[PDB]
Each structure stands twice: as structure tokens, then as C-alpha cells.
Design a protein around this ligand. Sequence first.
Ligand SMILES: [Cl-]
Ligand SMILES: [Cl-]
Ligand SMILES: [Cl-]
Ligand SMILES: [Cl-]
Ligand SMILES: [Cl-]
Ligand SMILES: [Cl-]
Lengths: 310, 310, 310, 310, 310, 310
Amino acid sequence: AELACFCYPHLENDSYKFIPFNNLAIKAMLTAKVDKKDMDKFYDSIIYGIAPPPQFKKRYNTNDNSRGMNFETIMFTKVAMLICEALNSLKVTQANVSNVLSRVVSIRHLENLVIRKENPQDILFHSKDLLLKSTLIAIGQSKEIETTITAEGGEIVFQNAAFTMWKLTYLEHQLMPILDQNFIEYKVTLNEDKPISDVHVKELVAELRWQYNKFAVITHGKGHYRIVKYSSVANHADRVYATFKSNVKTGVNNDFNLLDQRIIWQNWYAFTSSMKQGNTLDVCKRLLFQKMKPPFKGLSTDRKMDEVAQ
Amino acid sequence: AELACFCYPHLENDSYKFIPFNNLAIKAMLTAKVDKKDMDKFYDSIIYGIAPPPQFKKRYNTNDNSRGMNFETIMFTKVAMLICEALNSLKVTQANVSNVLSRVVSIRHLENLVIRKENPQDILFHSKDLLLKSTLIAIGQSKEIETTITAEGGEIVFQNAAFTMWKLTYLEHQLMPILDQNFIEYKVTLNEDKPISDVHVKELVAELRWQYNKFAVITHGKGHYRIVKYSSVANHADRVYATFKSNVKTGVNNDFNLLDQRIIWQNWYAFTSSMKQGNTLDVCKRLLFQKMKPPFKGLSTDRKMDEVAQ
Amino acid sequence: AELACFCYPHLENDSYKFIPFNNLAIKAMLTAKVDKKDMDKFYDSIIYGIAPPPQFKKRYNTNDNSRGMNFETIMFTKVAMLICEALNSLKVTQANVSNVLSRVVSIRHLENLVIRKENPQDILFHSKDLLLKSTLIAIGQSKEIETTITAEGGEIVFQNAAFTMWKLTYLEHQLMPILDQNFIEYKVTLNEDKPISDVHVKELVAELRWQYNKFAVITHGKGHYRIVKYSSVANHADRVYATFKSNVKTGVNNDFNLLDQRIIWQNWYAFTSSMKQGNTLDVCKRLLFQKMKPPFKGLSTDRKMDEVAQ
Amino acid sequence: AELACFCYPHLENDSYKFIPFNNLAIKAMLTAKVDKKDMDKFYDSIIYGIAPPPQFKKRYNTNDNSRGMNFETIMFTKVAMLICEALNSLKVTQANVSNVLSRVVSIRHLENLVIRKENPQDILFHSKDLLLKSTLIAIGQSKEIETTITAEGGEIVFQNAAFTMWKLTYLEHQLMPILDQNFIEYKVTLNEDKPISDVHVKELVAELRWQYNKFAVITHGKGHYRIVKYSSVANHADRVYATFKSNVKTGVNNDFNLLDQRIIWQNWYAFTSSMKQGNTLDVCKRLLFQKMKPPFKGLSTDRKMDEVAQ
Amino acid sequence: AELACFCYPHLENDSYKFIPFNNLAIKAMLTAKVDKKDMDKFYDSIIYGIAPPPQFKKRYNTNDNSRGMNFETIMFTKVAMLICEALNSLKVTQANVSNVLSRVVSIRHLENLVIRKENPQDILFHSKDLLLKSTLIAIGQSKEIETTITAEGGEIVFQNAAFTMWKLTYLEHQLMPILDQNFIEYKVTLNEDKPISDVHVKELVAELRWQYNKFAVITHGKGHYRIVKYSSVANHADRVYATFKSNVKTGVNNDFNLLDQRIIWQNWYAFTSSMKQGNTLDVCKRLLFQKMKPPFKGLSTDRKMDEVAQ
Amino acid sequence: AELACFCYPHLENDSYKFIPFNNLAIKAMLTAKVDKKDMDKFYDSIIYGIAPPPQFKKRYNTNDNSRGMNFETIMFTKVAMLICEALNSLKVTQANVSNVLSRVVSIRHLENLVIRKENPQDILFHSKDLLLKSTLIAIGQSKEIETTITAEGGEIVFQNAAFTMWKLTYLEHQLMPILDQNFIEYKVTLNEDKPISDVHVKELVAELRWQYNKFAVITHGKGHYRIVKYSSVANHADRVYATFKSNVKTGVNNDFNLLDQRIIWQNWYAFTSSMKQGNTLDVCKRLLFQKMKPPFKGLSTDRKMDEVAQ
Ligand SMILES: [Cl-]
Ligand SMILES: [Cl-]
Ligand SMILES: [Cl-]
Ligand SMILES: [Cl-]
Ligand SMILES: [Cl-]
Ligand SMILES: [Cl-]
């Protein structure tokens, strides 16, 4: 959802500060009759403060909407506050406020950061600089790519010198849980944005081939791998291409890290390279479904024999 | 109940301060043998402090009374304290104490204000001036009429530029819950005590005609609308007329805002206008039951067609 | 779903008898690798008997399907048996079996008949002839239209000399419950398939205008009224037109009872009359959304005044 | 455990009938002081009838034994009765009784047959001949091998024209549940003891390679496949070799079906062929751990591409 | 309690049949005003039939009595019926009825027989002759002594060729449970009323010395051992002597089996022998408390060494 | 487990401070691919800090290990902190760190000290010096032997002027509970490390002979008695001899207090004296199983007679 679904701007001393919404103010907005010229303007619920613009009613779950977020949840306030602490660390100026609040962000990403920041074991609990760095990446206001230390988080299921693999815990989320209970997705972040030796690559590929043979190794171009069911990789291609097509239309630059060709699923590397080369959706998406028959041979066999022993 | 059911006066430096009762002191009073000359005097339970006058035993629920209040409830203390903070904001003088404590107030109104004041989202939590303004209206010690910001509260179910509609939550109340579970009443407050444009009136009427077609739009004259089942509007007429008749007998002024004729139910506007003109109960109450066949035509049809679309 | 989702044919003495499936046989089928030439043929699970054709896997809820039926439910067997008792009352011959089993039926309709037949208060519990009549209507193997005595059932919420109004209990169903919890639909059956006096029509219309003002009074042409939210009447038009278009294409006769023009919602009567006259979907569906401004005036006022009294 | 852990022989008319034990008689035996010469003889608990020989106390779970069976369970009686119905279908003669009761059988196998026989959907519920055939195989008193119809049972997770794959439900068993909760084993039975076409073999291998890539496909020689974790295949080799070594020592014939070489895990086919050829445990077990690098190429790729589509 | 607390006599054809009381008839009796001359006569509750004589109110637990029995329990009816089946197996004649109903019996003994008779594993469930034999012993209407097969029952904790040791389950009883929760008593019955070899005696003594070193081995003279805490053996002596003194006063014969001197606790054998010789309570009870320092040496050591091994 | 399973060293100002692990850092380590040369080195989980060396994965319970500790428990952190407070009270220097962290300690001992230190009634709650003294004994970094005041703790079941007897509460432990539920062990500490009069010895022996006749009185040489089931004393001998053999091999001194010969079980005193004299395991362990037939005669009889009285 848009950043304007969690906070409204308030100017103080020629520098903007952002204020979380009260969920009851959102609840009052959802019952409001509003002019068409006011659907983009912030809403005054007399009792509970400012509420998001009524054009955003879709974003909130009501008895009629199940495709929004659970704003009456404590996690909503926590996520909204996390957004505000990041936006207040910037000094957004008047010309930028509407664009920053127009930014679409992953709510599940922001909830997982809250889960990290409130965990005393997690480094994000102890480093406001790292927490702010991670959030600014999450809200698209940072040049840096997500690595392990700044990762969205979840359950660590594999780690080596170069990579950390996370199980995405979206089924347990308070604010915007994924509703299909058949959902499983993993995420492999780089521990350091640096060249990675071949043995650490083999360690990752061997674990993905053995433990996750039913999953595609793909990427959305932002610097980390996504471990995704093969039955859903076609939908990922649609969303990835919609994003790449949007930035060409919107003029904003499309920087797409294809990542390691020896790790990425071959068909996905073909579909993304062809997309980067400027092909149409139909052209490069047909490369997902065509079997290109053609590294690290015997990696699966080595792991299996290590299981037969021990 | 009377304000004396929650607090007793204590003089300090020629200015009165009011003290909430302990519920155990009330419990001791209910078991007390008292002279007739002492039924109006405050009762000394040796152990738990001062208790209300024994003439008020009716007001408290016992195994023999279910038509009083649940004084052994934490909400009793909270409501009593709310009354005291308001009475202490005045400086009631000796001549006035008995009349102020004689004031009959709506307990459900005072409980809903407690619910607002303890909610951090509600403006009453943050403005002691607004909370005191709202309470002084509730206890009949203010000239101003209840508007949205100072409203008794409840669930917001409709809002526009001019009005806020509340669902009265009396079935969930701790202190004096309504016992018929078939009860539903709403309340429409003015956001601002100001002339209201015709479009904002149409928005309200269209919502009441469509969403609340089984409810009468009436008023008790104190500046806001009451959305009331038609099956109970006859009882409202009795209470409204008893009040109007009392003030004529008691000499206190009867100021009765009939409110907008285009919003009020036609029969109720007739019964209240006729009452204001000085007619007997039988005369003006017969106007409730007689069908006067004779605004905003097609408002119900427009809303219905907006539902057929979308 | 198709009748073949509940039973398979077994020939005995040149007359067909139908046998319910075991749900474990269905469970075995859902895990079966099957040739393409065998997707229409009944499946032999060695252990649990015959299973439906693998082309019907969509009809059964699995972890991957939530848009099918809960076949592992006792209600599945009960519904399947109800289908078999009806099909065995016919003597389906070889040429007819595949067409009878191809018939698409409302599962929720069949579950409600089970609910009636197992209720000792219901006449369907006591008359196997009436139960068989009701089921044969439900599975499209009867000339007669559904009336009150043969109705699908549910909760009676209104009744007079001519009509019975049922609340459809689909949210509580075991086999194929409706998942949107915001669902409410009613159904008005004729007590007798006979001309109906004007006073009994007024009684129905007055109750629908007063108690169900937010609902459209429509029909799918099979002889009874459906009380449906205005927000969903557009979807009903799509399904009704798809059915009418199918029978023109499939050559099967389209007999569409428009029912009483004084009861049916005006726009729906226009959309269905125009459909019957042979117009395209776009032509007659635009009549749903256009406000035609133009019986029984003051019916709503009479009911409201009866509430103000008593 | 031995068959004598569930029943004792009782002679009637020169033909033996077997009687289940009462669990309280077993409980009395476990507290009994017994001579050494009587440890093999059946025990008379005065109150609860005959009890198994005290040499079998190991087989029963007590507070000191957790490696036996839960005899105080209703499933014990059910399994014991199942054994007796099978033994009574034979007419065991005096010379044979002690050997038949000496037979060691899989308790989990017998419990799963009880689960099948008490399920009205299962064919074993309806065919006493099939139930007796299945039990006689289970207790080693039949020439025939276990196929699908006579299978031990469990959850069907794959089926085609030639094979049925069962999930072994040992963690949920009442009588002798497997205690490691990390246990998962499957079992592939032949639907018919017959030559099997190559396409039905490919269907099985493709499902095992894709859905069970972390499992070894082995066999214990009795005519069906066992789908077993690679980490436990070494323990299976020990038990398989102990059995093969026992029959050579005990003189009883060792008939070991190696099954299809294109389905069995290559190393297991080598270890079992070498065992059949008469090699020592060390010789043929080293073939499990040595990687022999050398059917049905691209089967895994075809299944994966079918997932990318649909 | 007396047998008259469970049944009343009804004459049929010059032979008495006994009828259980209804507990509501007992409840009516407990609230009855009765003449003194009628305190021994059976009570007519008009509604619930005959009730026990009002002189027995002590025997029934009321809010004022906790030292009686829980007659409103299903076990009361079961015990009463068990008494009646035994009394009806006799043909009590007119002269005997009052004496038979005057017999005092152990209610806990009778409840344990009910527990045996309703257990399908127990031989008492299957032999009405054995059940009647056991009950007639329990109600003092049989010459035979309690042995294992006719035992009161409980939990078997030791058994050998000659003895069965029972844990008395009185804390779990429905009708008259022992209320001190610190109660533990065992009972050793003879399997056969026959001379017993020395090895079977050693087996018992070794188990009592090792497993029950804090318990006295005593007897009440009726042919079986009672395993009793040393802290309570003084109370057993009081009750045993009261019984022996009663029969000398009442003239009824005192037959007291001292049982095996090598098993009985030495002091108890002295106290009972001295009582049998006709000494006063003070004389023979002082032998309980005096330490007589003087079989089967090293029995405790052998058992302990068998534990160090294995 | 080793002390390195709870903390890692961090140098500050030429003196080492020890830091507890986060359990999530341990959880990340358990999923880590690590070189062989790094299995002894502390592991960096990027997110949760330092983790123990991967050679210690055995020590932590996972779904595959049930023979380790429950590190995700709050008690793990509490025990780790207790270790750190003790290690920080020393000033471990660089040469000593690896040896101190190599020390193997009883986790159950450390958990019981946590239970003492967090109990406001316990002196360890109030004396940081006594708590540190007790912990340093527990982690083998103190010359002093465990006495009552510094005891591991548990339930006091006997106490006199010289001894305190504790019931070891290992079945209720959070971190490393004993899993056999048949476990019972006691521990007798000296109240003061001083010669003990004969009457206080008799008091202890009389209580152990009477109340714990099924338990062996042994010791592991560290200055206190262990009350242990006879069935497990053979396993204690194995562990005691393994320890004594280790220190002779490892060169570290073997100081073994045999304790009072009148209290220790005779066979254990023989096995430990013979071990101290330098005999092989087989030689001195055979003295456990051989019955040496040969203090304080009549102690058991005196206690029993005190029970017969009172
Ligand atoms: Cl990405
Ligand atoms: Cl008002
Ligand atoms: Cl219809
Ligand atoms: Cl096999
Ligand atoms: Cl006795
Ligand atoms: Cl020790």
C-alpha cells in the first residue's frame, strides 16, 4: 500500500514530520460521505484526528473488503510508527511530500522489520542506524540493496559465509497475512555485497537442489534471491514484467540485477535477460514454459551420500 | 440518577469539593436501619467512609433491585470521579450544593464519556478542557449543546461535513446496561453549531432513509437527532412531554430545538410543535398516530441505483 | 456440480441403479495419475470402490482447491444418497444415463433438502413421495416448479395464505457453504401454483418494502422470487442471461416465468422481459442501471404507522 | 512381537482355536514371581484368565519399559482378535502350534489392518476372505505377497494403473506407535502381481523423483517398495541383512524379490544383489556408501515444467 | 453399615425377596418427622417407595453428615442390587429376616465386588455362582473364607503360585471412599486354601520386606493378610479386639486364623495369640509396642542384589 | 555440557569478560554450513550475535536431537548469565580461556542454582558471595566442596544437625530435564565440613534404612552422598570409574572422598576403595555384585516401633 495509508505530513520549521493515523480515525473515514474533489485530501474525523484520504478505502479490511489490511491491529500502529521514524530521519521538503507518500511499499516487509526491531536478540533492536537503514530500503528511499543485516527477516533455515536463507513468515502476520495456507516462499540475501567464492555458491546450490527441489530460484532484480514454488513462478513473471514495464513508461530507471547465473533458475534467467533486452511480455514469458535442456554436476548426489552416511 | 448517587460535598476554604463514594460504603448503607428524619442525610458507614442518603437505595442494584445501577463495578468509581472532576472545576457555593447534587443525569451518557476519556485515540483523552466541557453538558451545568466533539460517544456509523451518526452501545455498558437485547438507538450530532448546506442535509436524509428505514428521526430538543425504532417512538413522546410539562410546572425555562423539518420525522415535528404551542398530551400525541400523508424526492432511489452499480 | 460427482451408474435387470461414492475413493482419485483418454471414465480405487471421473477433480476441495465441495463430510454421503433415491425412483435407461449424470445441480439446494428430510417436524421426513418430488425438481428431472411444500427449505421468516419466505442458510452449510460472510439471500415460494388475490400480494409487498428495503425482488424464471441484495443483482443478471443464452444455443427450451409485475423489482422485470424478447446482454442489462422512475402506494406508510401504534 | 503375545491355543475336537488375552491378565503376569522352568509356559492369573508366558514381559509397556506395546489399549484386543480369526481359519494341529505362536509379526502392520477392516469404505470391511488373506500374509502364514487390495494400508498419496503409494501412519498408532516424531516412511504396492508397462513405471519414478527426492526407493524383498529417508537406509540394510543371514542359518528359504531395477535406488539394488550372491555384510554394505555415478532422463524436468504451466 | 441400609424384605410364597431402596426414598426419610416407636420400622415415602428405618439416618451422607455413605450415587443402587441377588439366592425365612438385615458389612468390600462383576475380564462377570459365593462371604452368610478367586478385588501388585496381593482402591470409591488421602492398604489372599510350600512363602516375605518395608503384615483372623502402615496398626488392634470381645459377649463363636507365623508381623502374632488366650486389651496390646528382638535371613539382601544386577 | 555452550569470551583491558549467547544465534548456527577448520571457532550469525562453535551442535535439542539442551528456553539465558557472573568474578587470562570454556559441567546443577538464586527465601538470593561460591564449585573452578549452604538445591526431605537431604527435581527442569519418569535420586550434603558425632550419623542412617530402603547410599567422591536406586548403581560405577580413569590418563589429580564407611553402601565402599587402590574396572566392579554379608543394629527396628506408637 501507499505510505499515505499509515501517516500524514505535518510541517514544523520548514521540515516535514509524519504522524501515524489512529485506527478509529480510519474507521470513521470508511463510513464518511465525501465529495469527489476531496477523495484525495486527508480526512478530519472530529474525534480521532486525521485519517487517510478516502481514495484509499480499498487498503483497509472491512466486512466488505478482505483484500486490504487489518488496521485495527496493534501492528498497524507499530508499522506506521516505523514508517514515521524513517520519514522523520529524512527532512522531506514541500515538493517531495506527495511523492514520498505516494510510494507503494510491501506491508509484509514492514511488519517483519517490526518483528526484528522488537526482538532484543536482533541487531535491529540495538542499532537505530541499522533499523533506519533497513526501513529506508523497505520504503524505497535508499540506494542500498537489502542484505542480510538489513533483511526483512523471518526464520533462518540456511546460512554460510556468503548467504542467509529466510523462511518468509507471511501466514502468521497480523497486519496483512497471506490467506492461502499453501503458501511457502524463501529468500536468500547476500551477507556482504561482494564477489562470492565458488565454494560458497556450491554450498547454496547444493542446499537448494536437495532441500528445495520443488522451488524455483528467481529474483525480482533488487539484489537477492527468492525461493518460489514452480506453480507460482508464472505469476512472479507477470509482476516482475509489470514493474519493468512501468518504469520504462514512467521514465524511472530500471536497474535489474540478474544475479548469479549458476544459482538462478535457467528459464528465469532467460526470461529476465530477454526482458532487460526489451522484448515483449509474450516473447520472454514463453521462455519460462519452454524446456531449455542445458553447472555443479553431482552436487545433489554428494549431499544424498552424506545422508546415507551419518 | 441524581448526582448525589456518586459523590458527597466536602467544604474546603469556602469552596466545595466533591468526593466519590466507595461502593462498600454504599453496600453498608443498603443494609442500614435509618430514622425517617435521616433518609435525606448522608450516611456514615464507619468502615468505608460516607455513603449516599438512604432515600437513594432504589438507585443501586441488589438482589431485590434490578432497576438500579451496578455500583460494585469499577465503572461506578470512574463515573463518580468524572462527576467530581467536573464539579470541582466549578466552585459550587453553599446555596447551590443541594441543587447541583439534586440534578438527575443520564448514567449511560456519563459511562460513554468515561469510555471516550480513557481512549488514547479520542480527543477527550488529550484535552481536559474538552472533557470538562462534555461532562458539564452531560450533568446539565453548561449552556452549550452537545455537538460531535463533545458527544457522549459510541460507534461512528456515518459521518459527513455536517453530521456524525453514533450507534449507542448501551447493551455493553458496565454500570447501567439496557437489558432488552432488542435495543438499537442511534444519535446524530452536529459537527458544528452552524447553518448547514442542503447537500449535507440530503446526504444525511438519504442515509437514514436507505440504511435506517425502520427508524424514526426525532429529537428531545437539546440540539441533536435521535434515531429510534418506530415501535418505541410513543414512549419517547411520553418522556419528552413529561419533561416539557415538568419545566412549565417547575418554572424552569423550556428551550426546545425542533431541529430541521426536512430531517425530523413529520409526525414527531407535529407532536413537538403542538407541545411547544401548549397543547395537552392527548392532543399532540394523537398526531403521532394519525397518518399525515405529505422533501428530497428520489433520494432513496439514487442510493439504491448506486448499489446496483459498483 | 454434476450428478456424476455423487454417484455412478450400475445396471441391474435392464434398469439402472445409482450408487453413492465413498469419500476415500474420491480422495484416492485426486492423487491418481490418469491417461487423457480416461479422464471421463469412472475411476477404480482398488480399496474404496468406484470414484468419479478425474475430469471432476475441480469439484472437490483439497488444499489447493477451495472452490469445490467438502466431500469428506457426512453431508456428502447424505446428499449422494438423496440423489440416488431419486435416480432409482426413475428407471433411467442406457441412452439416458450420461445425460442424467451430466445434469448440473445446486449442491446447496440438495443439502437443504437433506436438512428437511431428517427433521421429524418437516413433512419431507414423513412423505417419501413429497421428498422424491422435491428432489426430482432439484435435479432438473421434473416438470413441476418448486412451491412451498417442495421447497429447498431454510428458515421461515414470513408466511401468508399465498407465500412463504425463507432465509437461505448457506453460511451454515457443511458441504458447500458460501464463504462470504456478508451473504444474505431470501426466497419466496408460492404456497399453491394458483392465481393469488390482491390482498395476499399486498401483504408480501408491504413486508418486502418495510423489512427488506435494501433487497431486490427478482426471479430466475423457475417460478419463485429471490430476495437479493441490490449490490449483487448485477451478478444475478449475468448468471440468468448466461442460462437463457445457453438454452438458445443448446436448443433446449427457455421457459421463463417473469412472475408478478407488481412484486418483481421494476428494473429486473425490464431486464428479463427484454432478454425474453431476444435482446443482447448489453441491451437488457443497461436497463438494470437506468433509473425508470415509475403500485400499492402507502403500503410502507401503513406498516410504519402500525409500528408507531402497539 | 510373537503371535503368543496376543493369544493362547485351546484345543477343540482335534483342531486348535486361539483365544485373545485379557490385558488385566497380562497386567497380573507382569507382577508375577515365576520359576525359571515356567517362564515359557502360559500364566494363570486366577481372576482374568490365561496370560502370555512370562518370558514375553519385554513385549509389554510398563513404567519401566517403553520399548514394548500398549496392551491396556482397545487396539490390543482388536489386533489379538484379528490374529485369532486368522489362526482359527487355519486348523493348526498339535505339532504346529508352538511354531505358529513363535512367529514374529509386525504389530504396526496388524494395527493398520484393523484400521482397514473397521472402515466401512474399505473393501476389507466387506470381504472376510480378503481380510483373512491380508492377515495371513501379515502373520507369515501365506504364500502370496502383499499387493494393494491386501495392503497394510494407510493414506493413499499416489495411485496409477500399476501402483498405489501409501503414507505409513505409524506416529498415530495406539498399540505400538513410532516414537521419533521425525519419522516418515511410504510404501508402494503393486496393484496386480503382473508385468507392468514402461509408462506406468515412468509415472511412479517421476513422482518419486519430484515429490520424494529426499527418500530412497528400496525393498525388503517381499514384493513391494519402501520409500525411506536416506539417513535411515543404512539401518534398513542392517535389518534386511540380519533377516537374510537368519534364514541361511535357520535353513528356511530366502526368496528375495529385488523388484524393478529402474525403480529401486541403485546402491540398494547393488547391496541386495551382492547379499543375494552370498557376500558378507561389510562387503555389500560398503556398496551403499560408495557413489556409483551411473534411466528415464528428463522425467524430473517434465514434471517441473508441468508445474510452471497450470 | 447394616444390610437394612440397602434393601427391605418382601415376602412372596413363604420365601423372602429383598428389594433395593430408591435413593430419593432415602432422601425423603432423612427429612421425616417420625415417632420414637417407628424409628426401627421401614419408612413409607409416598412417592419413591419404601425407605430404610429412620434409626439409620447416620449411615447416609447429608450436609450434616460426612461419615455416612453417598446414597444418591449409582454405585448405591449397584451395591444394593448385589446384596439383593445374594439374599434372594438364599431363601431367608421369617425368623431370620431381621438378623440377616441386622448384619453389618463392609460397604467398600461390596463396592469392589461390583467393580469386579461389571468387568468383562473378571471371572465374576462370567460366573454367577462365583459372584454369589463372593458376595455371601462379604455379607457374612457363608462358611468359606475369602480367597483370590472370591476376593474383594482391587489392583494386583504381586502374584505367585500361592498368593495374590491387592492394592485396596478405597480412595477412588464412589459410595464410601476413605477420606484421608494418605491411606494405603494392601491385602494378600490365598490362591488356594491349602498348605503352602516354603519357597512360595519366601517369595511373599521377600516382596513384603523389600517393597513394603514400612508396612505391618497382620490379619483380622478371617483367612488373609492385611498389609497395613505401622502408624495405623494400633487402630487395627483396637478394632480386632473389639470384634473378638463382642463375639465372646454376644456368644457367637470366635474363629481366628492366626495364619503363618513366618509371614505375620511378630508383635501382631503375639497380640493376637494373647487375645485368643483370653487376655485383656491392655495386656495383649502392650505386646504391640514392646520390641521383641527375635526367619528367612538374607531374603532382603538377595532381592537387593538382584536389583544391583539387571 | 562445556562452558562454551553458554558464553563466549570478550577481552576488555587485559581481562576477559564472558557474554551469554542468544538462542536465535544458536538456532542460526545449527543451520549453518561451516568449513572443517572452523568447527572449533565461534560462529557469527549476522543478526543475533556470536554463537557457540559448530562442533557443539550435539549439545542443543533440535528435531533431530533429543539428547541435548532446550536452548530456546528462558532458563538457558538464566543459566548462561549465572555462568558469566561467575566467570567475570574471576579474571581469566588469555592462556586460561579455552580451558575454562572447555570445562564440562552439570547443566541440571546450574539450573538448580538459578532456582535457588531467584527464590527470595533462599540465602543465595541475598548473598552474591554465597551464590558465586556455589557456582564456582558447580563449574569446577573452586577448591571447596559442596556443602548445604552452597548446595545445588532441590526439595529438603530430611535435616539434622549435620546433614541435609535433598530430593533432586530433575524431572521438572526446563533446560535439560531427565526424560525417564521413573527417576528418583536424592543427595545428602554436609551442613559443615567437620567431624560429625555418632548420634547425628545414626539419625541419617536410620532415616535412609527406613524411608529409603530401596536406595543405595553411594558417593562420586566430591564430598557428599548420593541416594540412588539399586537398579542404577551399576551405571554410577561406570561413570565414577570413567572419571577416575580419565584423571589418571589426563594427569589431573584424583581426590576421592570415600566418606563415612558406616553410611556408604558396603559394596560401593569396596568398589571405590578398590578403584582408589588402582584396580581395573572389572576387578572392582565385580565387588558391586558379590554379596559381602557383613553397624548400628536395630536402628530400623527403633524407627518402626516409634511408628507403631504415636
Ligand atoms: Cl529481488
Ligand atoms: Cl435531543
Ligand atoms: Cl427462480
Ligand atoms: Cl519389501
Ligand atoms: Cl483377615
Ligand atoms: Cl559426590
